[PDB]
Every structure is written in C-alpha cells, then in structure tokens.
Specification:
Four copies of one chain form a homotetramer. In chain A, 47% of the residues lie in helices and 14% in strands. The first copy, chain A, is an alpha/beta fold. Chain A has a single domain, classed as Rossmann fold (3-Layer(aba) Sandwich). The longest helix of chain A has 30 residues. One coenzyme A (COA) binds next to helix 4 and helix 7 of chain C. Chain B: This is Peroxisomal 2,4-dienoyl-CoA reductase [(3E)-enoyl-CoA-producing].
Amino acid sequence: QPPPDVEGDDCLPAYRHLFCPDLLRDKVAFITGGGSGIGFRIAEIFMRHGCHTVIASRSLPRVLTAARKLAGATGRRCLPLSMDVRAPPAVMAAVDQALKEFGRIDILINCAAGNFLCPAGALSFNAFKTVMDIDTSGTFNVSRVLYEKFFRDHGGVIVNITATLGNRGQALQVHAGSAKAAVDAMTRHLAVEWGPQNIRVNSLAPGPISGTEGLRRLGGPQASLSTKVTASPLQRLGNKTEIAHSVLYLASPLASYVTGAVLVADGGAWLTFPNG
Amino acid sequence: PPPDVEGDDCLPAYRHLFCPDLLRDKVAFITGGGSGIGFRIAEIFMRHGCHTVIASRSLPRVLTAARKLAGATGRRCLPLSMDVRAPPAVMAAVDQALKEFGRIDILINCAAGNFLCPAGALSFNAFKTVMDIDTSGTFNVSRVLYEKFFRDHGGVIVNITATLGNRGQALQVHAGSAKAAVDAMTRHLAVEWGPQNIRVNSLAPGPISGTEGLRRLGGPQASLSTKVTASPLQRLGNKTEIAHSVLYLASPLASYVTGAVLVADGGAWLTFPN
Amino acid sequence: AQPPPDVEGDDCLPAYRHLFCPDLLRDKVAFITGGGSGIGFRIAEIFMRHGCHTVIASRSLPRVLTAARKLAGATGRRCLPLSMDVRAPPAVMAAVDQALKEFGRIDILINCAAGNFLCPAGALSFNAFKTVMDIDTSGTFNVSRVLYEKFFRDHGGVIVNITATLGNRGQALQVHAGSAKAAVDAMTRHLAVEWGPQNIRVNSLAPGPISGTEGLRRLGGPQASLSTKVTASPLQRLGNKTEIAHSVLYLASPLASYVTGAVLVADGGAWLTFPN
Amino acid sequence: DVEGDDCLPAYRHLFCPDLLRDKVAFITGGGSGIGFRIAEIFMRHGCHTVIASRSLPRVLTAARKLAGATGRRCLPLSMDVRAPPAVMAAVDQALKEFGRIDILINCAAGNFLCPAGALSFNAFKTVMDIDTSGTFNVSRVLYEKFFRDHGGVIVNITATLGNRGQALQVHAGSAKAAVDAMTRHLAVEWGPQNIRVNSLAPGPISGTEGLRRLGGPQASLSTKVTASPLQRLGNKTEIAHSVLYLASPLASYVTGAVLVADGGAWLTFPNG
Ligand SMILES: CC(C)(COP(=O)(O)OP(=O)(O)OC[C@H]1O[C@@H](n2cnc3c(N)ncnc32)[C@H](O)[C@@H]1OP(=O)(O)O)[C@@H](O)C(=O)NCCC(=O)NCCS
Ligand SMILES: CC(C)(COP(=O)(O)OP(=O)(O)OC[C@H]1O[C@@H](n2cnc3c(N)ncnc32)[C@H](O)[C@@H]1OP(=O)(O)O)[C@@H](O)C(=O)NCCC(=O)NCCS
Ligand SMILES: CC(C)(COP(=O)(O)OP(=O)(O)OC[C@H]1O[C@@H](n2cnc3c(N)ncnc32)[C@H](O)[C@@H]1OP(=O)(O)O)[C@@H](O)C(=O)NCCC(=O)NCCS
Ligand SMILES: CC(C)(COP(=O)(O)OP(=O)(O)OC[C@H]1O[C@@H](n2cnc3c(N)ncnc32)[C@H](O)[C@@H]1OP(=O)(O)O)[C@@H](O)C(=O)NCCC(=O)NCCS
Ligand SMILES: NC(=O)c1ccc[n+]([C@@H]2O[C@H](COP(=O)([O-])OP(=O)(O)OC[C@H]3O[C@@H](n4cnc5c(N)ncnc54)[C@H](OP(=O)(O)O)[C@@H]3O)[C@@H](O)[C@H]2O)c1
Ligand SMILES: NC(=O)c1ccc[n+]([C@@H]2O[C@H](COP(=O)([O-])OP(=O)(O)OC[C@H]3O[C@@H](n4cnc5c(N)ncnc54)[C@H](OP(=O)(O)O)[C@@H]3O)[C@@H](O)[C@H]2O)c1
Ligand SMILES: NC(=O)c1ccc[n+]([C@@H]2O[C@H](COP(=O)([O-])OP(=O)(O)OC[C@H]3O[C@@H](n4cnc5c(N)ncnc54)[C@H](OP(=O)(O)O)[C@@H]3O)[C@@H](O)[C@H]2O)c1
Ligand SMILES: NC(=O)c1ccc[n+]([C@@H]2O[C@H](COP(=O)([O-])OP(=O)(O)OC[C@H]3O[C@@H](n4cnc5c(N)ncnc54)[C@H](OP(=O)(O)O)[C@@H]3O)[C@@H](O)[C@H]2O)c1
C-alpha cells in the first residue's frame, strides 16, 4: 500500500517521514511547474524535509495560490513567480529574484511540460514545435540560466522530469515522446559537461500518475484505463507522493554518486501498457 | 571500403552489390541532397534506378548538384529550395515533386545543422535552432509527405540521426538532444503509420570523411587520427558506405524493418573519448 | 506491400528474384549453426543463391544431411552438413577443422542455434534456465571463439548473431530466452570492440515473429490471439524467413562494411506493440 | 567510507533509522565488498540480515562484525549460488531463524580481466553460471519459499560493462546484461504477487575486490577517474544508499528499472 496522496493541488493532510526531516535543511529548490500536479507535490515534500522553494510557471495566480498552501502546511518559505520557460529574459528575471530573496539555489527541478493526445497526421508543425519548445528548449533554458547565475560557481543538482513515451513510440504522443527523449539525452550531456563543476543531473520518468492534468488529458476513457492499469505489473496507478519521493532521493545527498541517469518510476507500466 | 570522393561530386566509377534495378522508377525525396551524405545518397539511389528530388535552403547548391547527378547516372533529379522549418515552403516543394514525377516512394530526412559548443556557452536560440531544424524540421517534412502522398499510397522514410546522445558527447548537447528526439520520432511514426504501409527507420552514421559534419566537428587532425585508430574498425567511414546502409533501409530488402535504428559507425560510439 | 516469397517447411524457394547481385558472396564460405531448419535453413539457401558455399552445423546429423541435399539441389553451390553441439567445445573445434579441410577458408559465421519454449519463471527449473543460457549464450561464445582462433584472428571475418527483442520489455513466459539473448547482444558489442582490429565485424539481427518456423509454432500461442496481436502490430503481418535472411545477408556482406557492434531489429515493429 | 570489510566508526542518518525496522534482508555476497556495506547500512536502518556466500569463514567473520556494530542479527550461511540444493538449504535456515524474508539482494558475482580470444569456454561459462544462473536460482528459490505467498523486494546488483562492450570483460558484460533483462522479466511476472524487482549498476567503487581486480594500473586508473563526470571513485556507502532506496517503501512504485549509480563513469571511461 502506497504513501497517502490527495487528488487536487492541495497539501497532504498528514505525513510520515521515511527520509530524515532535515535531509534538505536550509537548501533552496527552484521548481518549474511547481503550482500544480507532480510539481506541487515535489514542492510540498521538499518543504517537509527542510527546503525552501521557488515555484515558477506561466500563471502568477496558479503559483500564488500554491505558495500559500505550501507555506501554510509546512512552515517553510515558498516564493511564487510568473515565468514562461520559453522566454529567456523572463527566466533570467525569475532566477535573479530567487537569488535576491534567498541568496542561493541548490536544486533545480524541471517539471514544466505540455501534452495532449493527437495523431501525428492531425498534428501541425506548430503543435509539435510548441511541445519541443516548452519541454526541451525550456528545460535547456532554465538549466543554462541556473548554471550561469549560480550552479557553475557553487555546484547544484538538477532533476529533469521526463517520460517513457519515446521507448516504444506510444500512439498519439509523437510530440511528447520526442521532446522527453531529447530531455533524457540532454541529461547525459549536461551530466558530462557539468559534473566537474559539482553539478549532478538526472531524469525521473513517471508512469500514469493519479490526480494530475497529465492523467486527465492523456489517460483516455476510464474503462480502458482501468483495464491497462490492472494489466500493469503493480496493478495500480502511481501517486504524486511516490513520484516526489523518487525526485527527493535524486535531488538529495543520498544520490551523491548518481549522475547522468534516468530513473524510471512507473510501476513497470511501459513494459506492459498497450500501444494500439 | 567502397570508394568515395571528398567533394560533392559524383563517383568516377561504381561497382554494384545491390542490383542496378533495386529502385527502378521509384522517386526519392532527399532533404539536404545537395551536399555531404545527402548528395551521395541521391547519387547511389539514382545508380539503382531511382529519380530524385533534392531540397534544401540554397537553390544554387541544389541546382549544381542536380546537374551533376543527372549527368552521372542518366536518371532525373529535381532541385528545390525549401527550409524544413517552413510548412508553406515544404508543402510547395512536395507539390512541385508530385507535379514533376506523379509519385514519391521514399523520403530521406538528412537536413541538419551542428557545430561544436560547450552547453554553458550555447545560447538559448542556438539550442532551439538545432532542435527546430533537426527535429521539428524532420517532423514537418514527414507529415507533409504523409498528407500529400504516403497516407494514401504507402512509403518509406529513413531519418539520418547520430549516436551523440547515447553517451552525452561533450560540445554536442544540441545535436545529441535533437537526434535522440528523431530516434523516438522514428518509433512513434512507425507505430502510427505502419497500417498505411509506411516504414520508418533511423540510420545513425559514425564520423564520415568528406563531409561538412567531420570538417566542423572532427576537432584537431592529430587528436582525430588518434580516436580513429583506437576505434573498432580503425578508420573513418565514407559517404558511399552510409549511402549503402540508407539504400538498404529504403529498399524492399528491408520490407520487415520498421521502427529500428541502424547504427553504421564502425563501432566508434563504443570507444570514442568523451 | 508484398513480402518476398517464402515457404513454410524447411524446403527451398521454387523461384527467387534477385534484389542483391547474385555474385554478392561469390565463392565465400559461411558457417551457419542451426542451418538445418527454420530461419537458419532459409539463411543458408539465400546465401547460396548469392554465390556462397555453406557449412550447416547442429545436433541432428539426419536433419543437416537432408537440408544439405536440398540446398545443394536448389542452388548449385556446396553445403557441408556437420553434427555438432555448440555447448561442447571439442566437437565445435572438430567441426570447424573439418570445414577448413573441405573449403580451405571460412568468411562468415552466423550463430543461429538456440533453444526456446514458453514457461512461467516461477515454474522454470534451474536446469531449464541454465540449458537455454548454455545453448544461446555460451554456445554462441564458443563458436565465435573457435572460429576466431582457427581462422578469423588471422584472416578477418564477419559474425552475425541471431537474437531477439524479448528482453527489452521482459516478455512473459520468456525469462530464459530474453536473458540469453540480451547477453548475446552485449556480447556482440564486446567482440566488435576487441576484434575490430583483426578485421572482424560482429553484429546482431533480432527477428520478430516469423511464419513457418519452430519458434512461431512453439511460442505463438493460440491462433486467434496470435492473429489479434499480429493485426495490431505496425506492419499487420508476420515476417517470413526470406525477409530475415535478407537482413542477415545485408549484415554479412560488403554492403555493411562500416557496420559493427550494432543490433539491427527486423520485427515489423512487433516489440513496440505486442502485448505483455 | 572504510577500505576493508570493516564497519563504519560513525554514521549520520539521511533515511530514518526505522526505515527497515524488523525486516529481514538475504544478501548474497554479504561477506565482503559492496555486499558487506549493504548489510551494514541495512542493519543501521533496523533490518536483520542473512549473508550467504561460498566461504563460511568469510561470512562468520563478517556476521560478528555486522551484529557487533549495529546490535541487529546477522545470520551467516555458506552456499554456492550455482547449487540449487544449497540455496534451498540456506533459505530454509533463514526462515527457521527469522520466520520471514522481506528483501533479497543478489550481489554474488565473479569477474577478472581477460581478452575474449584468451578466455576459455569454461571461464566464460563460469561467469555466466555465477552471475546469471546464480541470480535466477536464488530469486526463484526465494519466490517458491516465501515471496510468491508474501510479496517481497529483489535488488539485482549489475553493471554498465555491456553498454559499450568494455574490453577484457566479454564474460561479465554479457552476464550482467542478462541479469538486467531478467530484472524486467521478473518485474513483469511477479509484480502481481506484490514483488518488486530492480537492478542497481555501480560504477568503479573504492575499497572493493572489483576495483583491485579490474581497475588496472594506478596511474591510468587515476587518469580515467579524473576524466569522469564527478571526478572521483564511488564509495561503498554511496552504493549501499542507492540499494537501500530501491529495497525500501520509498521505492514503492519502482519496478523493472535499472538505476545506474556510477558517477557518470560509463559515459566517459575509455574502451578499445
Ligand atoms: C498547447 C499547450 C502545451 C501549450 O499551450 P500554448 O503555447 O498556449 O499553445 P496554443 O494553444 O497556442 O497551441 C499551439 C499549437 O498547438 C496546437 N494544439 C494545441 N493543443 C492541441 C491539441 N489538443 N490537439 C491538436 N493540436 C493542438 C494548436 O492548434 C496550435 O497550433 P496551430 O498554430 O497549428 O493551430 C497546452 O496544452 C498547455 O498549456 N498545456 C499545459 C498543461 C499540460 O499540458 N499538462 C499536462 C503535462 S503532462
Ligand atoms: C547555425 C546553423 C545550424 C543553422 O543556421 P541558421 O538557422 O541560419 O541559424 P543562425 O545562423 O541564425 O544561428 C542560430 C543561432 O545559433 C548560433 N550559432 C551558430 N553557429 C554557432 C557556433 N559555431 N557556436 C555557437 N553558436 C552558434 C547563432 O549565433 C545564433 O544564436 P544567437 O541567436 O544566440 O546569436 C548553421 O550552422 C547551418 O546552417 N549549418 C548547416 C550545415 C551543417 O551544420 N552541416 C552539419 C550537419 S552535421
Ligand atoms: C530444451 C531445449 C532448449 C534443449 O534441449 P536439451 O538440451 O536436450 O534439454 P532437455 O531436453 O534435457 O531439457 C533441459 C531442461 O529444460 C527443461 N525443459 C525442456 N522443455 C521445457 C518446457 N517446454 N517447459 C519447461 N521446461 C522445459 C527440461 O525439463 C529440463 O529441465 P529439468 O532438468 O529440470 O527437467 C529444447 O527445447 C530444444 O532442443 N530446442 C531446439 C528447438 C527450439 O527450441 N527452437 C526454437 C528456438 S526459437
Ligand atoms: C573464476 C571465479 C569467478 C570463480 O571461481 P571458481 O568457480 O572456483 O572458478 P575456477 O577458479 O574453477 O575457474 C573456472 C574457469 O575460469 C578460468 N579463470 C579463472 N580466473 C581467470 C583469470 N583471471 N583469467 C582467465 N581465466 C580465468 C579458470 O582457468 C577456469 O577455466 P579452465 O577450466 O579453462 O581452466 C573467481 O574469480 C572468483 O571466485 N571470483 C569471486 C570474487 C570476484 O570475482 N569479485 C570481483 C567482483 S565480482
Ligand atoms: N501526470 C502524469 O501521469 C505524467 C506522466 C509522465 C510524465 N509526467 C510529467 O510530469 C510533469 C508534471 O505533469 P502533471 O501531469 O503534473 O501536469 P501539470 O500539473 O499540468 O504540470 C505541468 C506544469 O507545467 C507548467 N507549464 C506548462 N507550460 C509552461 C511554460 N511554458 N512555462 C512554465 N511552466 C509551464 C504548468 O503551469 P502553467 O500553466 O502555470 O505554466 C503546470 O503547472 C510534466 O513534466 C509531465 O511531462 C506526468
Ligand atoms: N558527417 C558526419 O560525420 C555525420 C555524423 C553523424 C550524422 N551525420 C548526419 O548526416 C546528415 C548530413 O550531414 P553532413 O556532414 O553530410 O553535412 P552537410 O553536407 O552540411 O548536410 C546538411 C545539409 O542540410 C541542409 N540544411 C541545413 N539546414 C536546413 C534547413 N533548415 N532546411 C533545409 N535544408 C537544410 C544543407 O543545405 P542548405 O544549406 O542548402 O540548406 C546541407 O545540404 C546530417 O543529418 C547529420 O546530422 C553526419
Ligand atoms: N522463429 C521466430 O519467430 C524467432 C524470433 C526471434 C528469434 N528467433 C531466433 O531465430 C533462430 C532460429 O529459430 P527458429 O524459430 O528457426 O527455430 P529452429 O528451426 O528450431 O532453429 C533452432 C536451431 O538450433 C539448432 N540447435 C538447437 N540447440 C542446439 C545445440 N545445442 N547445438 C547446435 N545446434 C542447436 C537446432 O538444430 P538441432 O535440433 O539439429 O540441434 C535448430 O536447427 C534462433 O536463434 C531463435 O532464437 C526466431
Ligand atoms: N567493485 C566494483 O567497482 C563494481 C562495479 C560494478 C559492479 N560491481 C558488482 O558489485 C558486486 C560486489 O562486487 P565487489 O567488488 O564488492 O566484490 P567482492 O567483494 O568479491 O564480492 C563478490 C561476492 O560474491 C561472492 N560469490 C562469488 N561467487 C559466488 C558463488 N558462486 N556463490 C555465492 N557467493 C559467491 C563472494 O564471496 P565468496 O568467495 O565467500 O563466495 C563475494 O563476497 C558484484 O556483483 C559486482 O559484479 C562491483
């Protein structure tokens, strides 16, 4: 039986520490996409282990609402910021402020993505490139800004949130599959070039996770969903807290020797899911 | 190795190992077919009976190439100017091809852009441009050909990729990411399009002599010689060898191959320094 | 689009149209383990249709004597049948000596010998697992190693290992075969690196589900669900022996002069979509 | 960390000390190297252990040290992973002593440098028998004796050698690639019995027989280490942390995966 989760963008009402509560004490994590879904639960878990956060995505409203829930449930600081990962000046602006407020950033989680089901034949060039732009160029943009502004001189840890869609070429998902495959390759590249600056860089590829926009958009009809979930190895959907725990493992000193790796946390699902 | 020539010029002689009618009367649309690997793929194709359309941004480049290719092989070569990033231009090119030949049987996505640069010095726009050309560019040509012809008649796509992303090669985050995304795209399209009789595969070349790629990315000649003699086959590959493996994938001999990546790199990704 | 023709039994093709030049392997000699039945037999026939003489070697002397009569009957090239278990190195060494005595050289080794059956991992005995590792993995290494020491080390050569995609997603009922074939894939890379400097190319070909083979008969399952998964796979059909032999011939030939350490999958995209 | 097969003098917790409270882990190769440090770090989180390998004096010595440093129980047993009667006997003994086994760590292996043209048939086969057949045998025994009916968690310790076909290592590369494939097959078959199965692939780890054997001359090893992304060797405690992660409830949704914990070394290390 998995750790408890909540379907909405709300904090866990109770929690049991399996990592020590001081694992990230006084560190600061910058989380793109931290106002909703997996990125919000990542923020919440990090703050429950001593970490302050900065959460950044397009909607200033989404992150303000989130930052008050996070701060309230954990007593740590959460700086919300409006920032499109495709706009380098907005990215530079956000990182500058995070540093003005905190004086340091230790961890970057690239969680910002967009996705929707569309057959390749109906997918426009602009549609495909929009997904490449947010997922891949966005991840590069934020990483590259964090490197210049803080990590190159102080070291750091980056976790990229990816997917397994590209492994078997999942139908209706050429855009997301291609974009997140490029992010897994970028992880290797940055691990190589930035390791000498004491920067670790890894990916975490989640399976179908309950209580997320990604599952609502992409899961398909509930009866065919249940049937594929029941046929997957752990016979269930993952939850956001399980994903936040793997991300926390990778962003922490427990993972001090892990770099350039892709941890798949998907209950086995890519091995068995249908690709009709 | 089979012989090759360093320039974007035709082979002075060629020995057939495939039958000279392997692609008789087929039509191959080759992006980047005016130079480097793409020029040699066009030439080898035409020497197996195929007409070509070559397309890239520079009209002067494809015009001069097309005269060379027709002159050497006796088959037809249509040159077109088209940036793979511009759906109007790509649509216009595929129409022009269909108007000239009435069919396209094969698409070779060879157009790419690359250069050496540390990830920390690489600009936001430099990264995105490589993704736009290599990745979104490949998707754009593949989808325009699907809509205009391959959906209704079937077809074969060969994507020219790379091994850079396997080990995260230094100075290459842009190209390594873009070509890894092309390898996933290959699988996605193979699955979606297979039922329309379309095969889609990736061919990843190693370091190839006589190419802009190697000129830009090869590094100093002394350190290049050294990684080369320390790789499994002990030599650079040439363009003719790459054209043979592309021809294999594009031909009825690979009738059961789809969603695959064929690495043709003399074993180099296994031993090259990173 | 119409596949090249094939026949279901271990019999030669009635007609064949060349797509490779008929002198591609003019007067070369290929040693093919498992060349008496199934995929290995069709590989033998196709090679000999391109000028190559063959040695076909497996356990059952009756099987290879009958094959070799048929092969030589249909193509006008020579086929030496030998009885040899790949697990017994004195027998391999003697078979290879005998071939060198007959033909004076060997240019190509195709390692096609394998053992497979459906079995749940919880029912698979220790000896059953080991037996499949011993034939597929040790047996491949053994043959490759004898060929190296008897001829290829000094003369160069080309090796094609026939493998599978089962280990990619951990196909159920196939732990033995999937592990064994994943070892051979790794072995391909290892040997490509060590033996490249002796002018030896080593690649793997991984076939998908193939009509008119013992493999499909044993492992296909009932015809109705077999039909369903075939129809749901990207080319919507089973592969045939002739198509696999064409990919094997490609890799074994001078057209693949710069291909080594690679695994070419030739499965109609089956592993992307087949249920697990 | 500490070079020998000795316990750490001190240890600060990053996972809670009750993470594995009262669980039982059966660790093949638990008497030395990585296996010994895994047993120690598991015991520091509340776990009891069973350490099993061919040498009974090696595991007797290890067990007294592990118990002594941690106050948890460590049952040593002698068994060859290639002999299914012995594996069945050790597993029966662990069950008599403890009544349960929650976790299996398949750490036993044999390796040495040898060019492929010089490796004997028997030398190849031996490495395949220990790493591959051994790992299947222990997993399948544990499945039949306990995991099938009660669930459980397996961590296979593997390697990255097979990725680029590392020279001098055809045996070990092949064997470990087979065990990574087995990880996926068992994850799929046994997931519905509440069994998780993952691989952890370490890189070059200081204070181990692996590194003493396979590292080659010190000057050349220093060089490739400096040229690797984190510019240092891994230690045994870092590997035991990643193995603990996978073996714990923190990895409740991880199955069928390979975690590479090698400092990025396979990405840059020489080969040829
Ligand atoms: C499209 C998205 C990624 C980003 O939005 P955006 O930049 O505002 O993009 P727009 O809506 O302008 O759409 C851009 C292009 O994509 C196309 N597109 C967008 N959604 C699409 C869909 N569901 N199907 C097909 N085409 C689509 C648009 O039509 C437009 O293409 P065009 O110029 O040919 O018409 C949107 O899905 C989003 O913001 N998602 C965030 C939430 C999310 O995706 N969560 C799950 C992550 S797992
Ligand atoms: C850059 C290229 C890929 C694409 O051309 P383009 O679309 O006109 O792009 P631009 O010339 O506007 O350059 C795009 C960005 O990349 C950057 N860039 C180009 N060459 C660069 C180099 N060697 N190092 C770092 N950045 C570079 C530019 O400075 C610009 O960035 P900025 O906007 O931050 O100033 C060009 O190299 C090209 O056309 N190459 C084609 C042939 C080739 O590379 N063959 C090899 C394939 S192996
Ligand atoms: C078993 C095989 C792999 C090799 O034969 P062999 O070396 O004579 O081995 P045996 O007949 O002694 O069987 C060896 C072990 O595997 C077991 N075995 C054989 N077939 C089995 C099956 N279908 N299910 C479970 N176990 C099986 C035997 O019971 C024995 O184990 P045990 O000692 O615990 O009883 C046999 O299947 C074979 O000859 N295959 C060749 C043809 C083939 O497999 N073609 C398809 C490749 S796609
Ligand atoms: C060989 C080993 C794996 C297993 O020992 P064992 O089963 O008693 O094996 P043996 O000593 O009987 O050796 C079996 C074969 O391997 C060969 N072999 C052993 N060491 C070898 C070496 N360094 N180089 C080449 N061949 C070797 C033997 O000669 C024999 O082949 P043969 O019949 O052709 O003579 C041994 O190295 C070992 O016990 N290792 C465990 C510790 C270890 O390897 N740790 C490192 C990290 S895994
Ligand atoms: N959910 C799943 O089952 C699943 C499976 C595999 C992978 N994932 C991955 O997990 C991550 C989170 O997904 P989720 O399902 O939790 O959905 P989500 O809640 O919609 O998260 C996506 C986040 O990205 C932000 N975002 C989108 N575009 C952006 C941009 N251009 N700039 C900055 N921020 C942007 C969104 O906020 P704004 O709209 O405010 O920008 C949103 O908060 C993604 O990386 C996704 O690919 C999810
Ligand atoms: N050479 C190597 O060693 C090597 C190794 C691995 C992979 N490759 C791959 O092989 C292919 C050929 O490389 P090469 O070295 O032969 O280099 P090249 O000669 O420069 O080929 C690139 C071609 O792409 C065209 N092109 C670039 N951007 C374009 C755009 N936006 N739209 C349309 N056409 C475009 C260029 O023509 P215009 O300028 O007229 O547009 C040129 O003909 C590339 O895909 C490369 O990634 C090469
Ligand atoms: N058919 C498929 O769909 C498929 C799919 C994926 C992979 N493959 C691979 O394709 C190859 C051939 O399979 P197939 O389906 O055509 O089956 P097959 O006809 O049964 O071929 C297996 C052959 O191996 C020989 N063999 C078995 N054990 C041997 C040993 N110890 N020593 C020497 N030779 C031995 C057998 O001959 P004796 O009985 O005379 O020894 C038999 O000719 C195998 O490598 C298989 O793994 C097939
Ligand atoms: N060290 C590295 O840098 C490195 C790198 C990648 C992977 N690894 C992996 O990490 C694990 C431990 O390696 P290590 O360096 O720590 O070496 P190690 O100390 O030699 O550990 C190997 C263990 O395997 C046991 N063993 C060997 N054969 C056995 C058999 N037939 N049955 C039962 N037990 C057996 C040995 O004990 P007995 O002699 O008492 O049997 C020994 O305790 C191995 O799986 C290795 O492949 C290590």
